[PDB]
Write a protein that binds this ligand. Sequence first.
Ligand SMILES: *[C@@H]1O[C@H](CO[C@@H]2O[C@@H](C)[C@@H](O)[C@@H](O)[C@@H]2O)[C@@H](O[C@@H]2O[C@H](CO)[C@@H](O[C@@H]3O[C@H](CO)[C@@H](O)[C@H](O[C@H]4O[C@H](CO)[C@@H](O)[C@H](O)[C@@H]4O)[C@@H]3O)[C@H](O)[C@H]2NC(C)=O)[C@H](O)[C@H]1NC(C)=O
Ligand SMILES: *[C@@H]1O[C@H](CO[C@@H]2O[C@@H](C)[C@@H](O)[C@@H](O)[C@@H]2O)[C@@H](O[C@@H]2O[C@H](CO)[C@@H](O)[C@H](O)[C@H]2NC(C)=O)[C@H](O)[C@H]1NC(C)=O
Ligand SMILES: *[C@@H]1O[C@H](CO[C@@H]2O[C@@H](C)[C@@H](O)[C@@H](O)[C@@H]2O)[C@@H](O[C@@H]2O[C@H](CO)[C@@H](O)[C@H](O)[C@H]2NC(C)=O)[C@H](O)[C@H]1NC(C)=O
Ligand code: A1IYQ
Ligand SMILES: *[C@@H]1O[C@H](CO[C@@H]2O[C@@H](C)[C@@H](O)[C@@H](O)[C@@H]2O)[C@@H](O)[C@H](O)[C@H]1NC(C)=O
Ligand code: SIA
Ligand code: NAG
Ligand code: NAG
Ligand code: CL
Ligand code: CL
Length: 526
Amino acid sequence: IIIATKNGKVRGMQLTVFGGTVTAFLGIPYAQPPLGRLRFKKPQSLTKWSDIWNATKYANSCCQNIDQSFPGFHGSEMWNPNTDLSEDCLYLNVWIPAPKPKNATVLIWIYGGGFQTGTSSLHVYDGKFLARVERVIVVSMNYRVGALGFLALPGNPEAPGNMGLFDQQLALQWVQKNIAAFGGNPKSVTLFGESAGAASVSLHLLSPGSHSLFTRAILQSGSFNAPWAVTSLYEARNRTLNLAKLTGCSRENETEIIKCLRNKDPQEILLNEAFVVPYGTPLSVNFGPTVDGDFLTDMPDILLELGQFKKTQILVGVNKDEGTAFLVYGAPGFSKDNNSIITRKEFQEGLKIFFPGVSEFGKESILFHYTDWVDDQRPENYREALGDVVGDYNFICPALEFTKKFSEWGNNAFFYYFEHRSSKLPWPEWMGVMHGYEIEFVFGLPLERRDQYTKAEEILSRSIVKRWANFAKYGNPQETQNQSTSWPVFKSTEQKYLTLNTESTRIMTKLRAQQCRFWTSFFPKV
Ligand SMILES: *[C@@H]1O[C@H](CO[C@@H]2O[C@@H](C)[C@@H](O)[C@@H](O)[C@@H]2O)[C@@H](O[C@@H]2O[C@H](CO)[C@@H](O[C@@H]3O[C@H](CO)[C@@H](O)[C@H](O[C@H]4O[C@H](CO)[C@@H](O)[C@H](O)[C@@H]4O)[C@@H]3O)[C@H](O)[C@H]2NC(C)=O)[C@H](O)[C@H]1NC(C)=O
Ligand SMILES: *[C@@H]1O[C@H](CO[C@@H]2O[C@@H](C)[C@@H](O)[C@@H](O)[C@@H]2O)[C@@H](O[C@@H]2O[C@H](CO)[C@@H](O)[C@H](O)[C@H]2NC(C)=O)[C@H](O)[C@H]1NC(C)=O
Ligand SMILES: *[C@@H]1O[C@H](CO[C@@H]2O[C@@H](C)[C@@H](O)[C@@H](O)[C@@H]2O)[C@@H](O[C@@H]2O[C@H](CO)[C@@H](O)[C@H](O)[C@H]2NC(C)=O)[C@H](O)[C@H]1NC(C)=O
Ligand SMILES: CN(C[C@@H]1CCN(Cc2ccccc2)C1)S(=O)(=O)c1ccc2ccccc2c1
Ligand SMILES: *[C@@H]1O[C@H](CO[C@@H]2O[C@@H](C)[C@@H](O)[C@@H](O)[C@@H]2O)[C@@H](O)[C@H](O)[C@H]1NC(C)=O
Ligand SMILES: CC(=O)N[C@H]1[C@H]([C@H](O)[C@H](O)CO)O[C@@](O)(C(=O)O)C[C@@H]1O
Ligand SMILES: *[C@@H]1O[C@H](CO)[C@@H](O)[C@H](O)[C@H]1NC(C)=O
Ligand SMILES: *[C@@H]1O[C@H](CO)[C@@H](O)[C@H](O)[C@H]1NC(C)=O
Ligand SMILES: [Cl-]
Ligand SMILES: [Cl-]
């Protein structure tokens, strides 16, 4: 089972999935390893090889700091890298149906991780379910994260910024030139991703160098206009410089800095990423997408506002409790191991943690818009309010605003609202429908009966998988057979969206409308 690619022959392996077979090619290199003098530079193209590359195991994950706040707890550790970390991590994976499809639609996954963490090899990113059940091809790639992938000395090719995005872009290029050999249709490629993955997919909509590398886009819990998604050219420099000092690489010649940062073990670079900013938060993106003048030619809010993106269909959506995950990473009085009833004072302190550089008036204005209580006696008023504050500001309102803005230029948009809490979810109940916990459903993990998911979850994943795959194949995320609720287009007027849950799937209008008017009109002025 050998496929000949443009750079050489690759050998895959055979997966038994649901009384059937998927061919997995795990760990195909798609760039020269960005090592030595290649560190921080854009990804260079891969020299040809004469052997049979053995793509039979996930490859090295990119260097990254590991969440060690809940050691031994699956709800945190399920997200930590499950392969050796290395700078030599520019690899991708391909699941194709067996037998080899003819002209299959291709799904390209971009993982999240706040642009600091993440890896394609995670169990909740296993594409074999989608390959088997919908006969699409799934591709996923590793891209550089943290400083190693997003250090920015603007204009300077030694550290131009946005390398991780250019890593992704080079993977998309690989699919364009090689997926035909695997039975995929290069003309039918849907980027999908979650969180920073979703912000990445949205940036590929803007980057002209990506416009011909895919067809459609799916944005799960993320978009480039999210407040955490794009570093200012200022802060990127202040960040690059503060890193140079912490490592002792402060030089007058800016390239002499990069040279100095190139003789540091990655461990030294990662240990210093944290304090590169002055006041971090649980959502800090120390090194992330920047306006490099290359991948990104202008500030994306301007590009969005003036229709300067790929015209195509988008599938956008968010989860019901996007914000609760971050509350247990610093917020006072919070814990995954109790119900986290917090007081007014505790809520106010938590705003200082999530909005450190914000004026008191700004923080009071958040308090005022979110404490008009329907019941003052309700003891978790503040706990739920602080979670909604983080979710509405960081995910739901920018994702909604992205969808209005993008659809205003005549393209079909579909907006979902995931509100099912996984029956196997290891975080406590009050954290609800958390950030990232729609992904297993998108990937069809409840489709394996051999797990402990309920029948209702199997049906929900089954429908989501159909809707996702029909969106990839046909720009339309309906399920047309099992008498399903029709998913209407999101228009700027009606703003209709589809709820996803095991109970009843409903068409609703104008998600978080009052919340988002505050976050999208008033709060940016503070
Ligand atoms: C990439 O993957 C291939 C295939 O691996 C196999 O794929 C599937 C088909 C499945 O069977 C898997 O279990 C398995 O991983 C690798 O192919 C193997 O290549 C090595 C050599 O590099 C072979 O080992 C040699 O086999 C000889 C059989 O004639 C044997 O004589 C060899 O003994 C040595 O010592 C004597 C003593 O003088 C010498 O005379 C010999 O010439 C030899 O050097 C040795 O056992 C395996 O048998 C191959 N696998 C199979 C299943 O046959 C390939 O190596 C791998 N490459 C990389 C870089 O990963
Ligand atoms: C731009 O960076 C300066 C300097 O960063 C400091 O030193 C680094 C090595 C690292 O340890 C950072 O965490 C430090 O912040 C920032 O200046 C500091 O600001 C804090 C309070 O904001 C102050 O108490 C320190 O004394 C300052 N240190 C110095 C050397 O000036 C500055 O705030 C950053 N600018 C922005 C807009 O964030
Ligand atoms: C919920 O727990 C937090 C966290 O406290 C720690 O974790 C607990 C699960 C338990 O193992 C405790 O022994 C630990 O201290 C509590 O937050 C602390 O609250 C105390 C008293 O209010 C305060 O002195 C500490 O500063 C707090 N620490 C942190 C990190 O917030 C919280 O009180 C608990 N809430 C409820 C409703 O039980
Ligand atoms: C420090 N990180 C967060 C921890 C790391 C591992 N835990 C995984 C988890 C995932 C879902 C629920 C519970 C736990 C979460 S991060 O990955 O570097 C990061 C940084 C900035 C971000 C800004 C916006 C959105 C996401 C961001 C992520
Ligand atoms: C649709 O439903 C299948 C089984 O449910 C029953 O059978 C179908 C064919 C209907 O005629 C009706 O009797 C029931 O809904 C599932 O096996 C199948 O996976 C479902 N398809 C999707 C896309 O969810
Ligand atoms: C270690 C721990 O937390 N254990 C608790 C689990 C969940 O894991 C938490 O709610 C989220 O961590 O949930 C319980 O409510 C339960 O349903 O029996 C109590 C149990 O002791
Ligand atoms: C694949 O599909 C495209 C249209 O999407 C078509 O133009 C092309 O000829 C097809 N090629 C093969 C080999 O099926
Ligand atoms: C910095 O050093 C590099 C080394 O090749 C050189 O090309 C560049 O001109 C230098 N810049 C300044 C401002 O001295
Ligand atoms: Cl009160
Ligand atoms: Cl308002």
